[PDB]
Amino acid sequence: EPDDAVLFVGVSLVLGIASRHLLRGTRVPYTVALLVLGVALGSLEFGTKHGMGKLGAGIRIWANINPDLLLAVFLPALLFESSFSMEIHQIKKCMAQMVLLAGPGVLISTFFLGSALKLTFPYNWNWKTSLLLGGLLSATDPVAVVALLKELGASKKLSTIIEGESLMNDGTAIVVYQLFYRMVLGRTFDAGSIIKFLSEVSLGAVALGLAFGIASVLWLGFIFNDTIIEIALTLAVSYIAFFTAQDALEVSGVLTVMTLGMFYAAFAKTAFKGDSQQSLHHFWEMVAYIANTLIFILSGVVIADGVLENNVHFERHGASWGFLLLLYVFVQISRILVVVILYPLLRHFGYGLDLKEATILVWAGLRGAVALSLSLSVKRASDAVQTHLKPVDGTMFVFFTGGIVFLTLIFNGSTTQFLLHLLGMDRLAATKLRILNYTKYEMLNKALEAFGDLRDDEELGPPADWVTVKKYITCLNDLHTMNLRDIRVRLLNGVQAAYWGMLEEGRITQTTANILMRSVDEAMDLVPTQELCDWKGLRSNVHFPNYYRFLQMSRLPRRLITYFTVERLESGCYICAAFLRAHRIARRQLHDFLGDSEVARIVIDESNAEGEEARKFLEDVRVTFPQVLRVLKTRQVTYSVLTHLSEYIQNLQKTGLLEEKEMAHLDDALQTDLKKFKRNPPLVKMPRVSDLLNTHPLVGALPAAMRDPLLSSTKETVKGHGTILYREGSRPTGIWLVSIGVVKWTSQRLSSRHSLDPILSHGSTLGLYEVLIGKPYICDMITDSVVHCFFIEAEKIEQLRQSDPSIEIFLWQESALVVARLLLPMMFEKMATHELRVLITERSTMNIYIKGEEIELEQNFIGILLEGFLKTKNQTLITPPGLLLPPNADLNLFGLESSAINRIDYCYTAPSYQVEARARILFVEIGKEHSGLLSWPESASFSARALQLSMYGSMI
Amino acid sequence: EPDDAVLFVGVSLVLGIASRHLLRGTRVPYTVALLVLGVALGSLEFGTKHGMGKLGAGIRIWANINPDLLLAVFLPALLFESSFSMEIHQIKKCMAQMVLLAGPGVLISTFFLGSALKLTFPYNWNWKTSLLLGGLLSATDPVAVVALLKELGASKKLSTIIEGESLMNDGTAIVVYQLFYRMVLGRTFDAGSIIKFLSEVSLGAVALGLAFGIASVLWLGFIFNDTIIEIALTLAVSYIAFFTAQDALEVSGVLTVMTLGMFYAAFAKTAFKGDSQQSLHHFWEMVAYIANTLIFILSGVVIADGVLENNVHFERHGASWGFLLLLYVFVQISRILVVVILYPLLRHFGYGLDLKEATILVWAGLRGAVALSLSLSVKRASDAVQTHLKPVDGTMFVFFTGGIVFLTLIFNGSTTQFLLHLLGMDRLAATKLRILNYTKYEMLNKALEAFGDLRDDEELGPPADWVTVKKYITCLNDLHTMNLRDIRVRLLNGVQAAYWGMLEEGRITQTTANILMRSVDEAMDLVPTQELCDWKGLRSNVHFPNYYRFLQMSRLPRRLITYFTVERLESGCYICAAFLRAHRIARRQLHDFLGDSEVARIVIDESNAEGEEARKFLEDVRVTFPQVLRVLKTRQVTYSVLTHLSEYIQNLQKTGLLEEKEMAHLDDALQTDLKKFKRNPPLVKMPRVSDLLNTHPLVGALPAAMRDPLLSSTKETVKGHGTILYREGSRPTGIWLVSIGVVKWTSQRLSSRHSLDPILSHGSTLGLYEVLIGKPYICDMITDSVVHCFFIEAEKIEQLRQSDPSIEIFLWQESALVVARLLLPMMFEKMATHELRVLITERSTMNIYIKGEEIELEQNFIGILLEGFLKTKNQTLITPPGLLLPPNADLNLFGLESSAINRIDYCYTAPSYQVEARARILFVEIGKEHSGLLSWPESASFSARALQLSMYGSMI
Ligand SMILES: CCCCCCCCCCCCCC(=O)OC[C@H](COP(=O)(O)OCCN)OC(=O)CCCCCCCCCCCCC
Ligand SMILES: CCCCCCCCCCCCCC(=O)OC[C@H](COP(=O)(O)OCCN)OC(=O)CCCCCCCCCCCCC
């Protein structure tokens, strides 16, 4: 006969499925239908003489479940998913408010509801039974409210508040119930006794949870490439922790399971694989679904059993059916009182709480399966021979808690969306409409591209038209007046597009991307009145390391001192770096889109002024801990490489070109590398002087000979912020090889109207064009941050130009880069180093013309007169720093616009030119994903070795 | 006290984890360590007076498990994963051999081993107990052998044979055990009775399995976007089916669970989501892992309990410890005899079986958890008050089966790799080394590209060198003499690269890709002696539809007649289409790589002769069922679009730009579309005549006016294979607008030396250049398959050219496409329609020169003299079909090589040209993933509307 038990479980699941399939889209949850079906099954089995057969025998086997086994089997499953799948950052920033709703809230609710049950209900309960039942009804449901918020559509702050309030409240309400239930059994009490009991239970639960989490994370760290082992470890450790807490030490078990779930959620990236992240969550969601369905089917059956057994709780008199509604009203009043009493505190702590998101927090008081489990446990413990707990009192408890569980879900849970819509919320911001429409546009473009690519076929013929194929896909079924308000939104849209691109290209993880996107989203609401403010959200993540107090303090192993400083500074450095990249890209895109307009310039100035705090924190990390940034960048590049290789290996397995052994070996190696990286990330040594000089394109690409001379008598120098390298006008006495840092260039005669970032990064050569032409410097360069630089005097460069006829052309190709980034900043500033180097050294043509020849720029060619005096009628003398444009070229398209704001005399538009001295000209030819969000509605050879050294660290 | 039970489970899992973590890499499995730990726990609990506490109490609770509950709980979990995760195509093509090892094999083993136990063992067993124990030892383990093959590295044929033999054998050996066990209880028997029992059990099991599978697939079909529901449905249905079979109808339960698993594996794509495919498998692997660990821990405990209880099976006398080895020898001899008796049959049925892969099939006789479960069930059924089965006999059975389970895994399972290496197998083919090295090269390239892209940073500085970052990633740690043998391998490598590209670009699913890759792999072994033979593997998949007999037969609903014909022809049409695309791409790539060489030409001819069977089956589908190909192509394009949109939506969720409600809606719509497509794929109507004419680029891009004239008096014509459109030399009387089909062009004076496919697909215009120049046709075009074509007489085209000055240039741009695909086939034949159209209509320059002007081809420009008589010294007269090359151009790089094999007189290399009549010239400028596998070691305006109509079905 025990086999029938299995049947029950099976059958229950089926019912669950049905209830979760038909009652979808409708607002009433399916757990109410589950409870009704359970009551029906229990009544059929226990009331009718024939009842059921081979299934009723499986219901009875379950209706007599042990009071302790029930909890030990069903509570860890119910709680581990809710505790494990929760954002740590959000609650950590909101943890102040949740402490007020967890401790004081549960205390107030428990004592009110229980004091009301003692003074009103007629069952002659003493002051322990009533407050026992009051401790039950103070336990929310982390799954019911999770589903409600899934189908609700409220702001994220309120969602996080409710989702945490419920889980933290569940830990506290279970503790109080444990206390009052132990007291109901007969044990005496006292102030000291109550204090010791509460302290022991509460704190030992968390201690055991943290111990088990630490021991099982330390173990998981060494499990390379096997997901079944990790899932089984989580399961076994959760259940062992619950058994050890609730049944070995006599501490709270729900608290231990919650602490374990949270300790796992905090260390998910470090311990579990990246591909086993969606399988783990799905396994635990399946476990939690089974647990809820089984408990809701079981609780109905047990309620029906008790009712039919005693017969004093149904049709005996309307007393019970009225006192149930009275208890519901009391629960509502208790929640209202808790909220109204903690409002003066919940208003200005963590997140705000105005009348709206406080009237929506009082309604979402859904009861779930934890209260039902506790009621079933109490009823089962009473069904035995217990002088203290009578059987009628146990079924009085199974009846009231299940009755309150049904009325709360049908009324509060169904009318939580109607109320949220009535209050005024649930309306799109009208600034997310643009993002939605742009995403729909980008989806339509992807679909069009795929269709167009897959159309040519000689065998299967052509497909149907594009419209006939779009009618099937319903994912695409339906979709200068500029004020200071809209441009501040276009800039934030550009920032969002930059964040999107950075995460897609692998430059930032998904956690950092989510943090930055949340910051931008919370900032796009204050733009209608306040200036651009995106730095608020990240200011709490960019706290200068509190570790710095302790690096000043002495810790014995430098592994600990270097390891912990690179782990408190790791998130802030990445966030400020990404904030300052996204903002620099957004400024450039906005300048390109809205041209030069007074409002666009003011918004750009707002962004420039906003970036100052991040710039200063980055400057402070560079001087206080010099080796942190290099380690962080190396880790970033290594993680990007590993992610790309992982994506490539996963695509190879689908095809079947490689056998099981070889691909299993490939995958094993890749996963071992990924886990060894995420567990003990590598630390990069410091770079030697003579090493940096060899990674610099100019000095690195030179031959072994004629290089010992340049490197000898070259001393690296570390210059601080604001130091002047060379002033404009002074004679050309050097070239400064910037290998680490940034240098900002300023000029008095060069257009600084279209230059939004006059900075030259590492691997650059400053002052070479000027030492080649032998003339005074054309700009005043000043360091922008800490810069490691080398200075080679002019003589050495002259000797090197005199050495080989091919190290004269190399020097010129290397100086043309800086000359073109300086003269024409509107074209050659948005370009990356690789692209500009390719276009200026490979696809650009450097010609030398003898005296007398004629130069006629074809309409498509712009040219920079690198060297030599060129002549033209009425304009005989022309200085070498110079730009030759097509006679009819539109300046406004290249900058150079001669205006009162910026004077331009280094550009020439003439019919033809005639060489006056031996000239050297450079001719260049003229006429990225998600960047359209901003303005959507309106729209070998030395050169190859240098390019290698500039792309990769060393020549390959 | 029941709570302790939970502990046991938990603890067991931990042990499992440990045993599965330490005993990795080593050859001895971990289940033996599991059994040893279980024996240790059982001996500690039952032998010592103190034993254990709060855990031993949980062991006893388990050691007294019900004999039926044990099976009902543990067998479905053990069997559903093995039955569900199995290739259907492989076993279906090998199912002949598995029937011989399943029925006759189990019968022979059972009767031998059981006849030997009766004649040798001294326990005075009767002829039912001995053959009961003999029915146990005939049940293999689908999980032990699965893991063994995972860690073995043998061919795929032997792997599939063993993996199926074990699962099919498990279904048959359980049936026999059920029979003999029911007989041991006391029931009488007879020939008729035995026959009825066997038939009822065996067939009713499969019937119930198929019924449950059908009912649960029909249900799953309507579950849109929820994975938990699908996993819970599989679980609940599996357990309900097992309970209904084993405990309600008295039929075999393992057979029902196996039938259900197979019915699910056959309908995995149609019922389950694409993202819930890795979570379902992982959930069921977790269930199976728990089941194995629990059973192996439980069986050890029960063996120890029985031994310590009776004390006649350990140290009573060496009789037991010797008869155990004797029974092991008997099992080995029984397997050897089965194989030696079925060899004459297993040799030439399905897959072959030579001495090697038959000596490796005799060694892989691992016993697992099914035999242990049956032994535990028998011992438990005996432990009760049973006059038939004594307790000593039950523990004699738990001891022997567990003892045989341990000796088989330690000896056979550990020395199955040593034997496979000794026999000679386990050596790479030396033709997979090239693919492995090329994959390593492509991984290194991806890593280099990612590193180079992620290097420029103004904030975080530069990373370390490339070598310092590659030292961390260990996935990259380590890596004209041409005969008819190697070129036949390069062609197959090109075919493999084409298959890889087609699956990546979404043109074929993963099942078709695996089929084709398996065919190519099995074919690359016969090339050393036999010609190119890839069509063998697919000839069994390309069977002309057996449905055609039934389309001749009358089925009442055309939904059924059209639906079933598009489902028997669906896989063969896709396979032949992909075979003929991959082979056409491989031929082209090989001709490009090895130039014109006698061996390369012979290999190309071999491939051309091999493609004939697929070409003919495709021709037969086009005439017998005309609307099938259009429906298949529309489904292909729609599935590619949906896959691309799904990938795009999954990437959007990671960023957090869109709220929970909007993305949940997007994902819901996408998943609903995907499931409605995979469940009821759409059928495309037939194309109307006046519709096709409007999708043709030339006639479609014309304005509404001057189009009514062309379309009027135009009658579509369907011409069959080999029909002649127009012969070379005849006066130009028409233009044929090919909109569906293919036309092959042949010439007598045009080079057919570098043209590997002279075919023009749909949406092409033939005979327009000739009606424009008013001269005889320049090639003889003949249909290549069934072709739907329209004929507009010459007058109409002349009227249309006279109509507008901009519909003269459009006609010329449209004729230049065919002229350039015809004259210079080495450049303009590998190009897709989109690329060639862009390059010839947008990036190519058509100029008209007046009489007398001079033409000087710049060194980088090739030019086609579309119209007019051009002159040059000593070469006054030059006909318009003509090609002008740079005076120093290398013909061998463009074809045109004047040689005895192919004569060329339409190409001219001269210093300069002088117009003799008003000339019209066209100038073109001169100087893809995984295609390097072959030769790896050695290396608006009318035009825009036409391009739109050619890319997408209609103008957008
Ligand atoms: C969702 C994840 C759950 C993980 C489960 C962890 C392992 C569970 C271990 C099962 C323990 C078995 C309990 C047992 O031995 O049955 C005894 C119990 C009745 O015990 P008695 O009433 O005789 O106790 C005497 C005083 N009351 O039996 C009864 O009469 C009631 C039957 C209780 C069945 C409990 C089964 C566990 C839930 C199974 C669902 C799993 C779904 C995958
Ligand atoms: C891996 C997927 C498994 C899916 C499980 C499906 C639901 C399982 C339903 C559990 C049924 C509970 C059985 C029960 O009521 O306990 C009784 C049994 C002992 O029964 P008695 O010996 O008293 O029977 C009288 C005559 N022999 O109890 C005992 O003394 C032995 C204890 C048996 C425990 C069985 C628990 C199931 C396995 C739990 C593991 C799940 C892991 C997630």
UniProtKB/TrEMBL annotation, chains A, B:
UniProt-recorded Gene Ontology molecular function terms: potassium:proton antiporter activity; sodium:proton antiporter activity
Pfam families reported in the protein's UniProt record: cNMP_binding (PF00027), Na_H_Exchanger (PF00999)
InterPro entries xref list: Cation/H_exchanger_CPA1 (IPR018422), Cation/H_exchanger_TM (IPR006153), cNMP-bd_dom (IPR000595), cNMP-bd_dom_sf (IPR018490), RmlC-like_jellyroll (IPR014710)
Protein name: Na+/H+ antiporter
Main location: membrane
Keyword DNA repair attached: no
Gene: SOS1
Topology term for the membrane: Multi-pass membrane protein
Gene Ontology biological process terms, A to Z: potassium ion transmembrane transport; regulation of intracellular pH; sodium ion import across plasma membrane
Catalytic activity: K(+)(in) + H(+)(out) = K(+)(out) + H(+)(in); Na(+)(in) + H(+)(out) = Na(+)(out) + H(+)(in)
Domain Cyclic nucleotide-binding: 698-800
Keywords, sorted A to Z: Cell membrane, Ion transport, Membrane, Potassium, Potassium transport, Sodium, Sodium transport, Transmembrane, Transmembrane helix, Transport
GO cellular component: plasma membrane
Native organism taxonomy: Eukaryota, Viridiplantae, Streptophyta, Embryophyta, Tracheophyta
TM regions (residue ranges): 6-23, 30-49, 98-117, 129-149, 201-220, 227-245, 251-271, 283-303, 323-346, 358-376, 396-424
Compartment annotation: Cell membrane
